[PDB]
C-alpha cells in the first residue's frame, strides 16, 4: 500500500507518477492521514505537466501545518515557478505560496510577491492582490516591512477593474484587522475612480467595489447626491448580494442627505421595489433578506409602509422564513392593514407547527398591543381560537388575554364571562398564572370567582412559586373586594401559605398580607386594590446607537443576529 | 412545433419612434 505508492511515486515514468498523485489526492479526500509521505511527494514536484503540479500544490497546502519542518524543500520550486511565461502557472504558484501556513517560509516569499505585484498579466496581479492579504494575515509586521501597502494603494489607480476590485478587497481585509492607524481612506477622486470601474466590475467585484464606500463618510449633500446617483443603478442587478450591498450603501449615505430635497423621496421610492424583489429570492437568502428588512425597518419605516401583502408566509416556506414573516408583519402592522393582519394570523393558527403556533399567538398579541383601534377584533379572534379547543392554542390565548387585559382593561369586562368556563384544567404554568391574575384583577364580572379559586387551592403548596404567588394575590384581591363570600378563603390561604409554605418570597408575601389584613382591612382597598399606572410596553425598537452602527454592518453576520460585531466574534 | 408556444421573430428597434 504505502510502500507500493512510494515506489510508484519515486519512479521515472510519468504514467505512474500521475496515477500516484491521483491516488494520494483521493486517499486524503477519502479521509486518510497521508501526511507521512509528505517528503516523498516533494521529489516529484517540478514536472512539466500542469495536471500534476496542481495536485502537488494542493497536497503541500493541506500538508503544510502538519509538517512545517519538511516544508522547507519547496521555496526554491516556488521561486523557479514564479517566473514561468504561462500566467496560469505563476498564478497557481502565487496562490499556493500564500496558502502555506509556515512561519519560516513566508519570510522568503516576499521577493516573488514583490516581483508579481507589478506584473503585466492581470491574472497574476489579481492573484498577488489576494496573496498580499494572505501573507499580511499571517505576518502583519512582515507586510509592513516589505512595503506592500504603497503597492496595494496604486493598484486601485490602475486598469483591469477586476484587479482593482481584488486590490480593494485586499485593502479592506488588511484595514479591517488594522487598528485604524494609517487608514487607507481616499478623497472623493478615489471614490469617483472606483465608481467609474463599478459599472465594469464582475458580479463578485461589485461587492468589493461597494464595501469600500461603507467606511467612508460624506460631508456634503452634493457629494452624497452624486454617490447616490451611481449607487441607484445597482438596484437592478441579478446578484442578490449586490442588491443588498447597494441598499446598505444607500442607507449609510442617507445619513447625510437632506429630506427637504427631492432626492430623499426618490431614494425611498426606488428602494422598496428592490426589497420586494429580494423577498422572491432563494429560501436560504430569505432569512438574510428578512433580517435586513427588520434592521432597516426600525430606521426608516416610511419606505415599506405599503408593502404588506408580500409579507404573507407561503405554504412551502421554510420554518426560519415562517418565523421571520410574523415578525416582519408585526413590525409593519398598522391600522390600514389591521384586518389583513388579523386574517393572516387566523389562518396561521390552524397549522401544526407548535413553535409556529406560539409565534403566531405572540404576533397577534403584539399587534393587539401596538394598535388600540383593533383591540376588540383581536379579543374576538382570541375568543374564537379558544373556542376551538386547542391545548397549545388555549395556552397561548390565555397569556395573550392576560397581556391584553393589563394594557386595556377599561372595556374588557364583556370577555370575562366567556373565560369563566374555559376548561381551566390546563396545567401550563404560563397560562394558569395568567388565568389566576385575570380572575383576581377582574373579580367583579364573575359572580362565581370564589368557587373557581377552590379548584386551584387543592395543590397550591406544590403547584409552583409564580402560581402560588398569583393565587395568593388573587385571593387577597377577592377578600378585599368581596369579604362576605371569601372570609374563610383568606384565612385558609394565610394558613396554607404561611404555616405549610416554605417559599421565602412566598412566605414573606403571605406574612405581609396577613399583617395588612390584621392591621387595617379598610386601608387594604387603597393599598392593594389600587389603580396601577400605565404599563410601559417592552419597546422592540433597538437603541439608536446600535442601529446606527448596525446600518454600516449590512449583509454580514452582525445583521442576522442583530448583535454587535464585537459581541459575537472570537 | 414546440410546447409552450411557437417562437416568433422579433424586431430590431422602435421603428415608429425613430
Amino acid at each position: 500500500e504505502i510502500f507500493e505508492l512510494k515506489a510508484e511515486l519515486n519512479s521515472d515514468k510519468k504514467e505512474k507518477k500521475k496515477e500516484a498523485v491521483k491516488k494520494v489526492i483521493a486517499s486524503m479526500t477519502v479521509g486518510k492521514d497521508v501526511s507521512a509521505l509528505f517528503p516523498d511527494v516533494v521529489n516529484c514536484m517540478q514536472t512539466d505537466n500542469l495536471e500534476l503540479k496542481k495536485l502537488v500544490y494542493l497536497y503541500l497546502m493541506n500538508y503544510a501545518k502538519s509538517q512545517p519542518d519538511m516544508a522547507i524543500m519547496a521555496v526554491n520550486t516556488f521561486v523557479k515557478d514564479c517566473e514561468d511565461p504561462n500566467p496560469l502557472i505563476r498564478a497557481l504558484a502565487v496562490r499556493t505560496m500564500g496558502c502555506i501556513r509556515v512561519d519560516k517560509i513566508t519570510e522568503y516569499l516576499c521577493e516573488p510577491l514583490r516581483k508579481c505585484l507589478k506584473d503585466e498579466d492581470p491574472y497574476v496581479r489579481k492573484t498577488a492582490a489576494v496573496c498580499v492579504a494572505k501573507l499580511h494575515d499571517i505576518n502583519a509586521q512582515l507586510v509592513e516591512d516589505q512595503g506592500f501597502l504603497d503597492t496595494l494603494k496604486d493598484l486601485i489607480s490602475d486598469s483591469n477593474p477586476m484587479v482593482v476590485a481584488n486590490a480593494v478587497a485586499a485593502l479592506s481585509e488588511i484595514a479591517e484587522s488594522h487598528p485604524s492607524s494609517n487608514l487607507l481612506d481616499l478623497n472623493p477622486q478615489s471614490i469617483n475612480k472606483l465608481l467609474t470601474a463599478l459599472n465594469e466590475c464582475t458580479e463578485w467585484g461589485q461587492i468589493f467595489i461597494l464595501d469600500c464606500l461603507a467606511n467612508y463618510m460624506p460631508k456634503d449633500d452634493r457629494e452624497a447626491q452624486s454617490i447616490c446617483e451611481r449607487v441607484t443603478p445597482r438596484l437592478s442587478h441579478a446578484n442578490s448580494a449586490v442588491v443588498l450591498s447597494a441598499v446598505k450603501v444607500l442607507m449609510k449615505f442617507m445619513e447625510m442627505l437632506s429630506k427637504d430635497l427631492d432626492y430623499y423621496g426618490t431614494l425611498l421610492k426606488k428602494l422598496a421595489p428592490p426589497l420586494v424583489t429580494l423577498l422572491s429570492a432563494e429560501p436560504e437568502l430569505q432569512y438574510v433578506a428578512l433580517r435586513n428588512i427588520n434592521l432597516i425597518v426600525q430606521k426608516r419605516p416610511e419606505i415599506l409602509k405599503h408593502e404588506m401583502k408580500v409579507f404573507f408566509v407561503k405554504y412551502n416556506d421554510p420554518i426560519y422564513v415562517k418565523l421571520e414573516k410574523l415578525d416582519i408583519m408585526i413590525r409593519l402592522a398598522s391600522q390600514a392593514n389591521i384586518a389583513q393582519v388579523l386574517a393572516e394570523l387566523r389562518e396561521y393558527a390552524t397549522e401544526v407547527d407548535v413553535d409556529f403556533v406560539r409565534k403566531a399567538v405572540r404576533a397577534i398579541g403584539r399587534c393587539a398591543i401596538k394598535v388600540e383601534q383593533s383591540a376588540e377584533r383581536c379579543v374576538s379572534t382570541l375568543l374564537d381560537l379558544i373556542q376551538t379547543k386547542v391545548n397549545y392554542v388555549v395556552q397561548e390565548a390565555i397569556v395573550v388575554i392576560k397581556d391584553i387585559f393589563r394594557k386595556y382593561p377599561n372595556k374588557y369586562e364583556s370577555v370575562i364571562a366567556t373565560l369563566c368556563e374555559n376548561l381551566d384544567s390546563l396545567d401550563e404554568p404560563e397560562a394558569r398564572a395568567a388565568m389566576i391574575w385575570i380572575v383576581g384583577e377582574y373579580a367583579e364580572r364573575i359572580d362565581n370567582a370564589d368557587e373557581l379559586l377552590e379548584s386551584f387551592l387543592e395543590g397550591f403548596h406544590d403547584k409552583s412559586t409564580q402560581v402560588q404567588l398569583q393565587l395568593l394575590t388573587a385571593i387577597v384581591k377577592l377578600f378585599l373586594k368581596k369579604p362576605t363570600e371569601t372570609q374563610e378563603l383568606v384565612q385558609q390561604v394565610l394558613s396554607l401559605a404561611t404555616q405549610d409554605s416554605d417559599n421565602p418570597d412566598l412566605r414573606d408575601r403571605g406574612y405581609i398580607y396577613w399583617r395588612l389584613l390584621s392591621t387595617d382591612p379598610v386601608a387594604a382597598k387603597e393599598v392593594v386594590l389600587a389603580e396601577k399606572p400605565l404599563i410601559s410596553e417592552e419597546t422592540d425598537l433597538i437603541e439608536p446607537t446600535l442601529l446606527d452602527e448596525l446600518i454600516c454592518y449590512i449583509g454580514t453576520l452582525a445583521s442576522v443576529y442583530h448583535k454587535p460585531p464585537s459581541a459575537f466574534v472570537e | 412545433d414546440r410546447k409552450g408556444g411557437s417562437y416568433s421573430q422579433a424586431a430590431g428597434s422602435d421603428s415608429a419612434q425613430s
Partner: protein, 415 residues
Amino acid sequence: SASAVYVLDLKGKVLICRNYRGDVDMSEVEHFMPILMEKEEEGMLSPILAHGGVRFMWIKHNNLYLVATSKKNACVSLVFSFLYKVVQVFSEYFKELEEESIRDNFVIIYELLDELMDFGYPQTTDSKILQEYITQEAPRPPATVTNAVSWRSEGIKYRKNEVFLDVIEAVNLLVSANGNVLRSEIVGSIKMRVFLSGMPELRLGLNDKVLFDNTGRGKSKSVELEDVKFHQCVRLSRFENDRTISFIPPDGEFELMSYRLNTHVKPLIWIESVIEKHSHSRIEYMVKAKSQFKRRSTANNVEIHIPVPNDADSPKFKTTVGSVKWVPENSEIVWSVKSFPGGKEYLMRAHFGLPSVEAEDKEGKPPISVKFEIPYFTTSGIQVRYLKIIEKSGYQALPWVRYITQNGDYQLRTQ
C-alpha cells in the same frame, strides 16, 4: 469571508473540502452534523449554524449540504452567493448534482474550487468562461476574464446567427379560504439562448410603461413592471438614464431580465372546491374549475393538485374531463388535464373512505395548487418591440422568441 468551503453528504461524510484561509480547524466539521440534528429536532434548525465562535452557513443541495465555515463577521450574503454560483457551475459542468460525481470528478473539482475563490473572495464564476481554462478532458487563461466583458468570449463564430428568446410567465396566486386572493404577483422572466458570431451588442426594446410615458405614448397597452432585474450583461447606467436596454448577450442560454409586477386582474383559473367530510365515515370533493383565461388559449398539462385525506382509501372519482389519479406518495388528488380550452369548466365529484378510528395527531390543510401551463399567452400584456443586434463585422441576425404562460405560486388555501 468564508473560511473553508466543504461538501458534505446525507450521512455526515465530507465529500470534498477546500480551505481558503485556514483560520478554522478542519475537525470542526464533525460537530456540524450533531448540531444540525439537535437544531432540526427542536425547531431551531437554520442554514447558518454556530459551533462556538465558528459559524456554519450553508444551503441544502439535492444530496449534499454545501457548508462553508467562517469565524469573523463575514458577509453571509456573499457566502450564499458564492454557494449559489458554485451550485450553478457544478450543474453546468456535471449534468447531475449527486454523490456519483463528487467521488468521480475530484480531478476537476479541486481545480474548479481552487480557481473560483482565493482567500475567501471568489474571482471567477462564469461557467462558459471557466470552461476554457479548467477541463476534465492547460493553456493561458482567456482575455475575457481580464477584459471588462467577462460573460462573452471573443472570437465565437457560428454558421448562422440565431437568438431564441423565452418570455416565460409565472402566475403566482394566494387565494384565502374565504374566497379572496391575497398575493397575486406575476414574475416575468426573459430567458434567451443566444447563438451569434462575434460579440454582438443587443439593444432590447419592449413596450414598457415608463418608456411609453417618456416617449409620450403612455396610452396604449404597456407593461407596468414594478421590478426589473437585468443580468450582469445589461448595463445599469444605460437603463437608469433613459430606460435603454443595451447589453452583450452571452453564448448559450441565460437569464437576461426578470420582471416582477403585481396583477389586479381576475384569475385565469377559478377553482370552486367543496369538502363534504363526514366524521370518520366519508368525504366529498365538489371541485369545480372555471377557466377565466381567454378562449383562444389552451393551457397544456393542467394539473390541479387537490390534497385529499392522508389516510384516505378506496377512492372514487366522478369527474367531467381529464384523468384523475390519487397519488399516495404526495397524499393529494392530482386533477390532471392535458388540454383545457379557455372558458372551459370541468366538474369533479370525489368520494373516498375513512377509517373508523380517529387519527392520533392533526395533519394540517395543504393548499390546492394548480399546474397550468398555457403557451402563447402573455397575461401582463408585455410585447417585445425590437432587439438591436449590432456587430462590428456586420451581419443580418434572425431573432426569435416565444411566450410561455405557466403557474408560479398558484396555491389556493383550503377550508
